[PDB]
Amino acid sequence: AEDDVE
Amino acid sequence: AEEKAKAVPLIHQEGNRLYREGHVKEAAAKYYDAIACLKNLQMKEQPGSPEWIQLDQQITPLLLNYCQCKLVVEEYYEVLDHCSSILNKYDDNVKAYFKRGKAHAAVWNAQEAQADFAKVLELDPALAPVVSRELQALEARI
């Protein structure tokens, strides 16, 4: 998700 | 400094854990420390060299993680700068365009947001649903 972290 | 290249992945992992647990402020501190390690290593390398570039690339996702934490705590000025720095070197970085767009949108830079969100769309079409949503929300405040 774009609001998760890599 | 060099002995702490081993610390970075563990710090990265702890930051992620904290982030997903909801401890966003603490996660940011972790990311900041991981990036600081890599920057210290990078200072020993010649800018533009393979080793400098490799470290620069290891920094990118950690710096975007850090920016993600800043988005959550509603601090936009550093997101804009760090994302801009990343994008000025790596202009195909989807996540950087998206976060910068979020930050532009949050500070009422509607035109810069639309531009960034267009770049997200251009580079990763699978994100069309999200982008549409961000665009619809911008238009709503118009």
CATH number at residue B13: 1.25.40.10
Q: Is A5–B98 a contact, with Cβ atoms under 8 angstroms apart?
A: no
What's the farthest any 2 CA atoms get from each other in chain B? Answer: 53
Q: Which residue, chain included where needed, has tokens 């601090």? A: B75
Q: Which residues of B touch A (CB under 8 A)?
A: 15-16, 19-20, 27, 61, 64-65, 68, 71, 95, 98, 127, 130
Q: How was this structure determined?
A: X-ray
Domain that holds residue B70: 1-142
Q: Which helix (H) or strand (E) holds B67?
A: helix B50-72
- To one decimal, the resolution in angstroms is 1.9
Domain count, chain B: 1
